[PDB]
């Protein structure tokens, strides 16, 4: 097995917006170290993913009401191989990051509530490197499973999980999915050898 | 009753080569807090049927097993899954603390090849303050 | 409240194509002052949004028949803070532009028929500025409502409304939605303060 | 009958502080065309129940209200919505012209905060020639 | 009728990925003469369309299992007005290319199995030119029909057709659609005259 | 029986100006392999009702038609569709070979304006080796 390189892509992540179980709008490709995802309407900002201007033909009254509460949303930033999330909104955000959950010994599917004003490291490249190393030893099937470890899901305003009426993320009105391109590229250099 | 009583000889077969998850209790007749959890284990053994087996190993009558896994104090609970030590819980605890321990670690396997099994259910919740800040 | 700037983005609008209630194809970002949306098949034209080459797995016979009649379609252009629509098709086009409806004192939801050969100003930046000024005074909830005032919906060939068998725009086989980025950016500078 | 007969004193309560939309008719006993619409108003008052209230103010017996809203000729119809003047229609008209007037302005509110209410129904149609070209 | 030009666009094709009857991920625009479509996870490669990193909220266990077998997938390349497909995967790929079927006198809807290691010319520009010439003579309705002749559908691992349990392409778990931009542009120069 | 017996005079009407597809068999009393397919044609004529008409033209009694279409040997089958020659099959063949021939060419029309009709069904399958490699 040839050792991979911990290089970083130009775009450190991709963000896709959902309402319930439906994709809404196009994918946003983050080229800036620090950015926000908010409920406002600027269309031409490389540092802002504005969800407010996004149309959805099948949107219900509930979803519209929740969108109104996104506000300043979440600030996402990338520093020294680490990704952070800051809740700028006046409502909480809920994050499901297996890489984050691992760091605390939590269930990998854990949904963590980030209240307004709070900051949370939602990814660390080295933790993923450690997991990738364990997978190589455990075989190929274990390595394929690591794809979802490169993904993070985040819900605005409304929580989901065992403690909420909404049991799954596709039952929340406003959520996003993050793909971390660096780990995906690293994963790829392993996958294509095994 | 549905509780296996292990020995040093039978520990290999009953635990390591067992199907599914096995909860192994390390106890002794002189362990005060060990008697506290003894009725709790019976309730657990009956409520977690089909997904967990409760096993007890008396360390006096069977002194060989405990040091091999680094068991230096009792009560000590080792959760075994397909030959490996999945999780461990030490000291006396309530029925609720035991359920929270079990619910969080009955993941099944033996990952990472079965990591998908952990996302095919309803996810648990934490607050950022649960990290204790 | 800090006064906003009536600046114009590089891309003056975004166009999304629909069939019935389904998104079809990718979004087209207009960088040219004058452009067309037609039923032909050029894939590499910044001045043409060709709908003819777009696939839709769930397309029915009706939709296919209507697509055949789009023809030269609509010419959309941007001059001095104003947006116009010209019906190039041999069939009519139907436009729902609240900003246009306002100019004539029409119901804001009014669908207006533009027959072949006809030209219609479908947006004027100043009318929107006037409305935005009234909203600031009426509060924040009024300002959020202005998002749809930055959008225009247009149907090819088939009309919809109280006078047609099709009551809603998602019952028409071929329609587009326009987002006007300038007004959206202006709206955003207000939203983020309130 | 379901038609309120206003006075200068009762105009404040019956119109400005009223729930929903109120159609206020300004008429007089000498107004010819005012008598033309008088039977039409009765039909409107009964067909638009629950969504519109028809009110009549005799300007002879009540001369104070009309000048305040700049009513200089009759018949004159003011459509009131939550205290404001929503729409106005002047001169004699047919039952059909009155319905078209009502249907286009029973928007409700009081916008822009309730502008969404105008897109939750079936949109009306115009031709580009309806601009009169 | 003015003669068209057999010029080639910058992007010689566009590829859209599907699972069953659902679009998954964004469209990939090929700017390179030789490229692959595989089941791995590189996000930043102009020569690779990696399907492994693509999320689908409504994905079932079947689709996931089939994705695992895409492997190195298909290599697609463009040489001298001809397009080729090479099966790099350890499983077969199935191609429906009317332009290819024409070359062999096959039914134009024919699905052709390409087993691992095998190479197949899936498009030739001149065959299309011949067909386009026959259409001009047969009238306008015949020319509109040629749009689908600019498209190719390809399924990974699972076959479809009269010999398989899956009768239609939207019943296969992993397939792509190719739009050949050159022929589409040529078709367009004809369409806009007729 | 549902088999048309053509003549040189009636060939124009019965074949060229006929609705749907017509299978024209060119045969003679001395053609050995022509008698081989003769019972097969009867089975085809009955199984392909409503979508195909089977017609036979004896080239001895009717010598004018065969050379016009370049028929130089028999048995020869011409599949006619709306006046044109759609497909052609030469020589003796089995019932299965005849079905495969028919199934692949009952496309209908007369394309390209009806090319869509070829994608509104279940597509047939080939292997890359069916090109014979």
Burial of A4 (0-12, 13-18, 19+ CB in 10 A): middle
Tokens matching residue A94: 């809920």
Structural method? X-ray
- A188 with E26: Cβ contact below 8 A: no
Q: Give the 3-state secondary structure of residue F96.
A: helix
- E147 with C52: Cβ contact below 8 A: yes
- E41 with A185: Cβ contact below 8 A: yes
Distance CA D53, CA D41 (A): 10
CA F45 to chain CA mean position, Å: 11
Handedness of CA B85, B86, B92, B95 (dihedral sign): negative
The residues facing F78 across adjacent strands are: F24, F88
Any chain E CB within 8 A of the CB of A26? yes
Q: At what angle do helices D32-47 and D95-105 cross, to 10 degrees?
A: 50
Handedness of CA C23, C28, C33, C38 (dihedral sign): negative
Distance CA C93, CA C86 (A): 9
Task: Decide the pairing of beta strands D3-5 and D53-58.
Answer: parallel
Q: Which residues does chain A have within 8 Å of residue E55's beta carbon, measured at their own beta carbons?
A: 16, 151, 177, 179
Tokens matching residue C7: 């600046």
Tokens matching residue E30: 């090929």
CA-closest candidate to residue A5, choices A137, A173, A182: A182
Of residues C41, C57, C58, nearest to E187 (C-beta): C41
Task: Decide the pairing of beta strands E175-180 and F21-27.
Answer: unpaired
Q: Which of F31, F37, F57, F98 is catalytic?
A: F31
Distance CA C89, CA E152 (A): 30
The domain that holds C159 is classified in CATH as 2.60.200.10
Of residues A107, A120, A143, nearest to B128 (C-beta): A120
CA B17 to chain CA mean position, Å: 15
Q: Give the 3-state secondary structure of residue D50.
A: coil
Any chain A CB within 8 A of the CB of B119? yes
Distance CA C59, CA C52 (A): 13
Q: Which residues does chain E have within 8 Å of residue C42's beta carbon, measured at their own beta carbons?
A: 184-185, 188
Distance CA A73, CA B126 (A): 20
Distance CA A146, CA E83 (A): 35
Decide: F52 and F102 in contact? Cβ < 8 Å. Answer: yes
Any chain E CB within 8 A of the CB of F120? no
Distance CA A152, CA C172 (A): 37
Distance from CA of A53 to the nearest CA of C (A): 7
Distance CA E155, CA E169 (A): 8
| Residues in Cβ contact with C77 at an 8 Å cutoff, skipping those fewer than 6 apart | C33, C34, C35, C83, C84, C86
Tokens matching residue E48: 């690779």
Q: Which of D21, D31, D55, D59 is catalytic?
A: D31
Decide: E189 and E5 in contact? Cβ < 8 Å. Answer: yes
Burial of C172 (0-12, 13-18, 19+ CB in 10 A): buried
Handedness of CA E164, E169, E171, E176 (dihedral sign): positive
φ, ψ of residue D88 in degrees (nearest 5): -140, 140
H-helix or E-strand containing B105?
helix B95-105
Tokens matching residue D59: 């300007």
Q: Which residues does chain B have within 8 Å of residue A104's beta carbon, measured at their own beta carbons?
A: 126, 131
Residue of C nearest to A52 (CA): C147
Name the residue with tokens 């309407």: A41
Of residues A26, A43, A68, nearest to C184 (C-beta): A43
H-helix or E-strand containing A136?
helix A125-138
Judge whether D113 counts as a catalytic residue: no
Distance CA D102, CA D110 (A): 16
Domain count, chain C: 1
Residue D106: count other Cβ atoms within 10 Å of its Cβ: 17
φ, ψ of residue E69 in degrees (nearest 5): -105, 5
The residues facing A157 across adjacent strands are: none
Of residues A26, A170, A184, nearest to E43 (C-beta): A184
Any chain C CB within 8 A of the CB of A40? yes
φ, ψ of residue D3 in degrees (nearest 5): -120, 120
Residue D117: count other Cβ atoms within 10 Å of its Cβ: 13
Judge whether D31 counts as a catalytic residue: yes
Of residues C9, C27, C177, nearest to A26 (C-beta): C27
Any chain C CB within 8 A of the CB of D131? yes
Domain count, chain F: 1
Parent domain of A14: 1-194
Parent domain of B123: 1-133
Of residues E42, E57, E58, nearest to A185 (C-beta): E42
φ, ψ of residue E186 in degrees (nearest 5): -65, -45
Q: Which of B6, B15, B23, B31 is catalytic?
A: B31
Any chain F CB within 8 A of the CB of E134? yes
Name the residue with tokens 């930055």: C150
Distance from CA of C69 to the nearest CA of E (A): 11
Any chain C CB within 8 A of the CB of E10? yes
Distance from CA of A177 to the nearest CA of C (A): 20
Name the residue with tokens 């049991």: A167
**Chains with at least 3 CB pairs less than 8 angstroms from chain A:** B, C, E
Does chain B reach chain F with at least 3 CB pairs under 8 Å?
A: no
Which of A132, A188, A189 is the mutation pick for testing E, counting most E CBs within 10 A? A188
Long-range CB contacts (within 8 A, 24+) of F80-86: F80/F15, F80/F16, F80/F18, F80/F21, F80/F22, F80/F23, F80/F24, F81/F20, F81/F21, F81/F22, F81/F108, F81/F109, F81/F110, F82/F109, F82/F110, F83/F16, F83/F17, F84/F110, F86/F21
- B113 with A146: Cβ contact below 8 A: no
- E43 with A191: Cβ contact below 8 A: no
Any chain B CB within 8 A of the CB of A168? yes
Burial of A166 (0-12, 13-18, 19+ CB in 10 A): middle
Any chain C CB within 8 A of the CB of D117? no
The domain that holds F16 is classified in CATH as 3.40.30.10
CA-closest candidate to residue D128, choices C120, C70, C123: C120
Distance from CA of E150 to the nearest CA of A (A): 26
Distance CA E179, CA E27 (A): 10
Residue of A nearest to B117 (CA): A109
- B113 with A111: Cβ contact below 8 A: no
Report how far apart, in Å, the C-alpha atoms of F76 and of each of F9, F21, F51, F69, F88 are.
20, 16, 21, 11, 7
Q: Which residues does chain A have within 8 Å of residue C19's beta carbon, measured at their own beta carbons?
A: none
Any chain C CB within 8 A of the CB of E21? yes
Angle at F60 between CA F59 and CA F61, to 5 degrees: 95
Q: At what angle do helices C125-138 and C181-191 cross, to 10 degrees?
A: 20
CA-closest candidate to residue E75, choices E20, E154, E22, E181: E154
- F123 with E115: Cβ contact below 8 A: no
Which of A22, A23, A41, A71 is the mutation pick for testing C, counting most C CBs within 10 A? A41
Q: In the Cβ-directed half-sphere of C133, how many Cα atoms lie within 13 Å?
A: 8
Does chain B reach chain A with at least 3 CB pairs under 8 Å?
A: yes
Q: Where are the beta strands (DSSP E) in C44-161?
A: 48-50, 74-79, 82-87, 93-96, 111-114, 119-124, 151-156
- D125 with C145: Cβ contact below 8 A: no
Decide: E63 and E56 in contact? Cβ < 8 Å. Answer: yes
Q: Which residues does chain E have within 8 Å of residue F121's beta carbon, measured at their own beta carbons?
A: 109
Any chain A CB within 8 A of the CB of B107? yes
Q: In the Cβ-directed half-sphere of A40, how many Cα atoms lie within 13 Å?
A: 27
Long-range CB contacts (within 8 A, 24+) of F61-67: F61/F7, F62/F6, F62/F7, F62/F8, F62/F11, F63/F8, F64/F8, F65/F6, F65/F8, F65/F11, F65/F26, F66/F26
The residues facing C75 across adjacent strands are: C36, C86
DSSP 8-state code for residue D58: E
Largest CA distance in chain F: 47
In C104-142, which positions are buried (b, 16+ CB within 10 angstroms) versus exposed (e)?
A: eebbbbbbbbbeeebebebbbbebbeebbeebbeeeeeb
Q: Which ranges of chain C would DSSP assign to H, the alpha helix?
A: 61-67, 98-103, 125-138, 140-144, 181-191
Largest CA distance in chain E: 53
Residue E55: count other Cβ atoms within 10 Å of its Cβ: 16
- F115 with E104: Cβ contact below 8 A: no
Tokens matching residue E87: 């099966």
Distance CA D103, CA D86 (A): 13
Distance CA F113, CA E141 (A): 5
For chain E, the C-alpha Rg in angstroms (whole number) is 17
H-helix or E-strand containing E82?
strand E82-87
In A15-43, which positions are buried (b, 16+ CB within 10 angstroms) versus exposed (e)?
A: bbbbbbebbbbeebbbeeeebbbbbbbbb
Distance CA A75, CA A36 (A): 4
Decide: D15 and D22 in contact? Cβ < 8 Å. Answer: yes
Distance from CA of C180 to the nearest CA of E (A): 23
Any chain A CB within 8 A of the CB of C142? no
CA-closest candidate to residue D133, choices C112, C128, C91: C112
Which of E57, E68, E69, E88 is the mutation pick for testing A, counting most A CBs within 10 A? E57
Residue-wise DSSP of A39-81: SS--SS-TTEEE-TT---TT--HHHHHHHTTTTT-EEEEEETT
Tokens matching residue C160: 């919809």
Distance CA A118, CA A87 (A): 6
Distance from CA of C164 to the nearest CA of D (A): 9
CA-closest candidate to residue F130, choices F102, F94, F92, F104: F104
CA-closest candidate to residue C14, choices C151, C127, C137: C151
Tokens matching residue E63: 């689709």
Distance CA C138, CA E18 (A): 47
CA-closest candidate to residue A55, choices C14, E58, D107: C14
């Amino acid at each position: 097995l040839q050792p991979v390189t911990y290089c970083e892509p130009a775009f450190w992540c991709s963000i896709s917006y959902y309402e319930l179980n439906q994709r809404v709008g196009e994918t946003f490709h983050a080229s800036q170290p620090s950015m926000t995802v908010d409920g406002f309407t600027d269309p031409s900002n490389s540092e802002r993913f504005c969800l407010g201007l996004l149309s959805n033909v099948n949107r219900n009254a509930a979803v519209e009401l929740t969108r109104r509460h996104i506000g300043r949303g979440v600030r996402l930033y990338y520093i020294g191989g680490e990704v952070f999330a800051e809740c700028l909104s006046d409502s909480a955000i809920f994050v499901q990051s297996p890489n984050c959950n691992q760091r605390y010994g939590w269930h990998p599917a854990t949904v963590c509530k980030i209240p307004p004003g709070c900051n949370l490291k939602i990814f660390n490249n080295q933790e993923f490197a450690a997991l990738l190393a364990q997978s190589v030893n455990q075989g190929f099937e274990a390595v394929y499973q690591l794809t979802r470890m490169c993904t993070i899901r985040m819900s605005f305003v409304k929580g989901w999980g065992a403690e909420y009426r909404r049991q799954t993320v596709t039952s929340t009105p406003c959520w996003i999915e993050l793909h971390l391109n660096g780990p995906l590229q690293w994963l790829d250099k392993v996958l294509t050898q095994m | 009753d549905k509780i296996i009583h292990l020995t040093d000889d039978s520990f290999d077969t009953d635990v390591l080569k067992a199907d599914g998850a096995i909860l192994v209790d390390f106890w002794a007749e002189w362990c005060g807090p060990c008697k506290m959890i003894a009725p709790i284990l019976d309730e657990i053994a009956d409520e977690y049927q089909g997904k967990l087996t409760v096993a007890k190993l008396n360390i006096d009558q069977n002194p060989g097993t405990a040091p091999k896994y680094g068991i230096r104090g009792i009560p000590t609970l080792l959760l075994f899954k397909n030959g490996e030590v999945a999780a461990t819980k030490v000291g006396a605890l309530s029925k609720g603390q035991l359920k929270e321990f079990l619910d969080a670690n009955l993941a099944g396997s033996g990952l990472l090849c079965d990591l998908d099994a952990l996302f095919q259910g309803v996810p648990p919740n934490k607050s950022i303050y649960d990290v204790w800040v």
